[PDB]
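Regression check, chloride ion case 447:
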Amino acid sequence: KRDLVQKLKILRQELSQQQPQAGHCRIEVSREEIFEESYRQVMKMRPKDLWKRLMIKFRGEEGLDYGGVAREWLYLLSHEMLNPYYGLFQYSRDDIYTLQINPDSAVNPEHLSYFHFVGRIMGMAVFHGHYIDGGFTLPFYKQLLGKSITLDDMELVDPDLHNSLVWILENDITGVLDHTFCVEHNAYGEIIQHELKPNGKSIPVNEENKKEYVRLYVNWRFLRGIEAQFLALQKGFNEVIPQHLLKTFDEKELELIICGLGKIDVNDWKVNTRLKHCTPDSNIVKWFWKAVEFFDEERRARLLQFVTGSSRVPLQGFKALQGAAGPRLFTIHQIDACTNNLPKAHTCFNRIDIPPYESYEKLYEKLLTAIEET
Amino acid sequence: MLIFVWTFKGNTITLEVEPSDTIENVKAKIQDKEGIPPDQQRLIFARKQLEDRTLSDYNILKESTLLLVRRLR
Ligand SMILES: [Cl-]
Ligand SMILES: [Cl-]
Ligand SMILES: [Cl-]
Ligand SMILES: [Cl-]
Ligand SMILES: [Cl-]
Ligand SMILES: [Cl-]
Ligand code: NA
Ligand code: NA
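Current build output:
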């Protein structure tokens, strides 16, 4: 915990000296075309331009605050560029809160520039202390750090391959296994073979080079089909954050500084909540926290989504919640309305409007209905 | 369903099978695709030998990948 606090101070120090004293990074985008216009303007820019003080404007809008507009721009932008709709990313199989690179991304012929674009955007979020609106697997952060994938990381990406590779390491393959430093996989209804190293097609796997074989084959099975895309993204990222600034971070730390805090603590939440037209000991407020206490992590993510636009919070947690103009704590507003209404959200204000429901069960059920997934 | 086998040559067959079968017939199906006699086949998955039981016994499931190694007389 402390060690991360020191690692972040050191990163901030070094990012600070990388920033030029003079000049600005100027972006002016329409809100309806944030993605494509941000892409054209950022890709015109040199790496060095991306370190300058951010100066962002929405077309036709005067912002309250340049830092605020910047915060909003990255959140809105990253929500577009990561949306599987544009073909670059997809939802991971078992989890909709985790994105993966889409292997089929090349239907966009220009797709590598977009991955390069995404890298630069993620790097700019780190460099300037904002957050990305999304999330990736831990092996993705690990590859983004330049670390290699353990075998342990296979226990989710491929249990059947994980077990076979484990068995190869545990037992003597002499005479039993005629494997080669080349691997085959199913690509577009077809079988395509891939050397894990130069001339691997001609290199037997044996008891002496087993460990090297399994290391190369894990690393390959993560990058399988997405290699050029990851390279382009990682180039964009390291154009903003040089890879040596993150030597001392592990994958879980990179995820916090890029996406913020995913684990939602109810006590930190309760304590940094404002109340409008209700009191700490009023029923609507007791029931709300009772329901949040029962909500599992997915449900709490959706409730936070509903009221703020983000299922994540800053590193500092709920006291650091931002709204429109600067900070705005989470706010529960008890409203004078018909008790069959659902809670309504005002995400510019991190405010939820709640009617004076008659029982805990009514609030519980009506809250769950409000935060239904889109 | 339709389980696969990653063999000791790197070959990665597709095998039309059923949980109604037993691994003896599996070996026959392997004897079908690539003609490896059952008595020099040794099948592993869950890090463990498959004694001559059914696929629906070893906690084997659909669209899975066994590891076929060489039993060595
Ligand atoms: Cl401009
Ligand atoms: Cl800045
Ligand atoms: Cl302004
Ligand atoms: Cl009351
Ligand atoms: Cl923060
Ligand atoms: Cl009403
Ligand atoms: Na800085
Ligand atoms: Na404007």
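Comparison notes: The domain at 153-223 of chain A is CATH 3.30.2160.10 (Hect, E3 ligase catalytic domain). Residues A 53-54, 128 surround chloride ion (ligand 2) (CB under 6 Å). No diff flagged against the previous build.
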